[PDB]
Amino acid sequence: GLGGLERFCSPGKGRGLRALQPFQVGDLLFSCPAYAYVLTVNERGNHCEYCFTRKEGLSKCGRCKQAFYCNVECQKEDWPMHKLECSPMVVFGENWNPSETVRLTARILAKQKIHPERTPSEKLLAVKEFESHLDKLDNEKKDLIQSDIAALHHFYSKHLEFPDNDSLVVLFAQVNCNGFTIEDEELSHLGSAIFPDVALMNHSCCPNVIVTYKGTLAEVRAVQEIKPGEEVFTSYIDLLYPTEDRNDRLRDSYFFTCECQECTTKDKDKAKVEIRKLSDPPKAEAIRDMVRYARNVIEEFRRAKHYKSPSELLEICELSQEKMSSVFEDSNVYMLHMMYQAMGVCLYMQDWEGALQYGQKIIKPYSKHYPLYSLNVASMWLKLGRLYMGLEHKAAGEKALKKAIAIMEVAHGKDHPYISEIKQEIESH
Ligand SMILES: O=C1COc2c(CCNCCN(C(=O)CCNCCc3ccc(Cl)c(Cl)c3)C3CCCCC3)ccc(O)c2N1
Ligand SMILES: C[S@@+](CC[C@H](N)C(=O)[O-])C[C@H]1O[C@@H](n2cnc3c(N)ncnc32)[C@H](O)[C@@H]1O
Ligand SMILES: [Zn+2]
Ligand SMILES: [Zn+2]
Ligand SMILES: [Zn+2]
């Protein structure tokens, strides 16, 4: 197993991870090497396919020209996994489009063939033991899994010996239940991976640990003091949202309702859905209508980013914020969601001033809605610092970068390469 920790039966939460020794804020509980991992398509050329090192001058694979490495060693070591895609990418050309879930699942199947025995990534929980929620699958989810199975056969039949369709549905469901996104210091999506021992941890909206990445290695650090006998919890979702929103997401993606202190007390719900202090106060039904409108625009915008222009996307943000502002305060989470989306569009358009304008409005309400040590808060401070630095506002940039560092020292560790980069940004000016 893992020193100072153990697998146990968590009442009403299946299997979980329990502490056997105290952990202080910032302590590393454990590390978990990726069992299977894939670099996201849009990050190719920026990070090494094998070790995820972000570097300039990465060497391109000579055959496909769509895989980049540190050197010949990273190239060689990645070959058992890269071979699943190398020739297929050149053969299918423009038609090569398997989803990231399918890409990861192909790598799980390849790893099971090469290494059927328990790996150092499975000291407490094995990939084969993963919870699937197969019995809870509705028609919509089974149809999505069937599309994924067809893409798997379509793009990965060369090297893989497929189990029956029934075993594949269990696998795709286990991957959705237990799969991780690997994010960078700005929470930008890098890829997807399987960390079996990390997937043993249950969810809480007031977590006592944070998962970070050092290349393809997952690291688990305490963000609250943990005592012997206490269960180790991480957050599976974005904690900005009120209780109902959080539980709608947990029920849909993880088939459970959270009963943590935040979900039971609903303490932060009032400030999260802050209402304007108007002479004629807004009616209860007028609030409920705006909350319904707010959830609908969030989904409308989510769809729109796939086909609308940057100006159309900014229009949706501006127009929706205007309608919401008649009922909602600026610190309200639905206002903040649109502002964050608008900042993202500005960043893409390289409208640094516009991005800074939004980020400045988001930061204080983020600090109040998120937990004490939050990667969402650290990431926003970091973006702000980088925008300030890029726009020659060095004193403001240094202050924001140091706010990011203070959180990251706890979550990523004092010695994390990301902190060394940020300190170099402060020093280089
Ligand atoms: O064990 C875990 C896993 O989740 C955690 C997370 C969430 C990170 N993973 C997010 C990426 N991801 C998903 O969210 C999959 C959810 N699928 C959406 C709805 C759905 C659910 C079930 C099925 Cl059946 C299907 Cl059809 C569709 C997947 C996208 C595809 C690649 C794999 C990840 C954070 C901290 C954690 O500690 C955990 N712990
Ligand atoms: C990644 S697994 C965590 C390990 C899991 N308990 C097991 O036995 O394999 C995610 C699943 O654990 C359960 N789970 C996680 N957190 C929970 C919580 N706070 N309350 C109830 N169930 C939870 C749900 O069934 C969820 O889909
Ligand atoms: Zn490398
Ligand atoms: Zn190649
Ligand atoms: Zn909760």
Q: Which of 254, 258, 263 to mutate to test the pocket of ligand 2 (most atoms within 8 A of CB)?
A: 254
Task: Decide which of 133, 160, 178 is a domain's last residue.
Answer: 178
The residues with which 47 forms a beta bridge, in sequence order, are 44, 54
b/e map 345-364, b = 16+ CB within 10 Å: bbbeeebeebbbebbbbbbe
Provide the CATH number for the domain around residue 337.
1.25.40.10
In angstroms, rounded to a whole number, what is the distance separating the alpha carbons of residues 363 and 384?
A: 9
In angstroms, rounded to a whole number, what is the distance separating the alpha carbons of residues 78 and 89?
A: 16
Q: Ligand 4 centre and the CA of 184: distance in Å?
A: 24
In angstroms, rounded to a whole number, what is the distance separating the alpha carbons of residues 107 and 82?
A: 9
Q: Ligand 1 centre and the CA of 179: distance in Å?
A: 5
CA–centroid distance for 403 within its chain:
21
- Say yes or no: 191 and 242 in one domain: no
Provide the CATH number for the domain around residue 187.
2.170.270.10
- Say yes or no: 279 and 401 in one domain: yes
DSSP 10: -
Total domains in the chain come to 3
Cβ-Cβ contacts under 8 Å for 411 (sequence gap 6 or more): 210, 212, 221, 223, 373, 375, 378
- Say yes or no: 128 and 27 in one domain: no
Which H or E element spans position 140?
helix 139-156
Return the ligand 2 atom nearest residue 130 CA: 9
Cβ-Cβ contacts under 8 Å for 392 (sequence gap 6 or more): none
Cβ-Cβ contacts under 8 Å for 178 (sequence gap 6 or more): 130, 131, 194, 196, 199
Q: Which of 61, 167, 51, 47 has its CA nearest to residue 112? A: 167
Could you tell me the end-to-end alpha-carbon distance of the chain, in angstroms, rounded to an integer?
46
In angstroms, rounded to a whole number, what is the distance separating the alpha carbons of residues 199 and 14?
A: 12
DSSP string, 266-286: -TTHHHHT-B---SSPPPHHH
DSSP 70: S
Sign of the Cα torsion 259, 260, 264, 268 reads negative
- Say yes or no: 312 and 380 in one domain: yes
Cβ-Cβ contacts under 8 Å for 117 (sequence gap 6 or more): none
| Residue the block writes with tokens 């146990």 | 8
- Say yes or no: 243 and 145 in one domain: no
Task: Decide which of 209, 236, 263 is a domain's last residue.
Answer: 236
| Whole-Å CA distances, 271 to 90, 365, 380 | 53, 9, 20
Residue 233 CB–ligand 1 contact under 6 Å: no
∠ CA 352-355-358, rounded to 5°? 150
- Say yes or no: 34 and 61 in one domain: no
Contact (Cβ atoms closer than 8 angstroms) between residue 242 and residue 333: yes
140-143 long-range Cβ contacts below 8 angstroms, 24+ apart: 141/173, 142/169
Contact (Cβ atoms closer than 8 angstroms) between residue 408 and residue 419: yes
In angstroms, rounded to a whole number, what is the distance separating the alpha carbons of residues 240 and 340?
A: 12
3-class secondary structure, 30: strand
Strands (E) in 163-276, as ranges, are: 180-183, 189-194, 202-203, 209-214, 217-222, 233-234
Cβ-Cβ contacts under 8 Å for 301 (sequence gap 6 or more): 313, 316, 317, 320, 338, 341
- CA Rg value for the chain: 22
Residue 173 CB–ligand 2 contact under 6 Å: no
- Say yes or no: 21 and 58 in one domain: no
- Say yes or no: 201 and 318 in one domain: no
Three-state secondary structure along 337-350?
Answer: HHHHHHHHHHHHCC
- Say yes or no: 130 and 110 in one domain: yes
Amino acid at 173: A
Residue 234 CB–ligand 1 contact under 6 Å: yes
| Residue the block writes with tokens 């959180």 | 407
In angstroms, rounded to a whole number, what is the distance separating the alpha carbons of residues 95 and 255?
A: 34
DSSP 168: H
Q: Ligand 1 centre and the CA of 105: distance in Å?
A: 13
DSSP string, 353-396: HHHHHHHHHHHHHHHHHS-SS-HHHHHHHHHHHHHHHHTT-HHH
Contact (Cβ atoms closer than 8 angstroms) between residue 28 and residue 223: no
Contact (Cβ atoms closer than 8 angstroms) between residue 254 and residue 223: no
- Say yes or no: 96 and 112 in one domain: yes
Task: Decide which of 236, 254, 279 is a domain's last residue.
Answer: 236
The residue segments making up the domain with residue 87 are 43-178
In angstroms, rounded to a whole number, what is the distance separating the alpha carbons of residues 333 and 275?
A: 11
Longest dimension (CA), the chain: 70
Q: Ligand 2 centre and the CA of 366: distance in Å?
A: 27
| Whole-Å CA distances, 227 to 5, 36, 41, 409 | 11, 32, 41, 21
| Data resolution in angstroms | 2.4
- Say yes or no: 110 and 195 in one domain: no
Is 429 labelled a binding residue?
no
- Say yes or no: 157 and 9 in one domain: no
Cβ-Cβ contacts under 8 Å for 289 (sequence gap 6 or more): none
Q: Are strands 15-19 and 5-9 parallel, antiparallel or unpaired?
A: antiparallel
Token pair of 140 as six digits: 């919509």
Residue 247 CB–ligand 1 contact under 6 Å: no
∠ CA 251-257-260, rounded to 5°? 140
3-class secondary structure, 425: helix
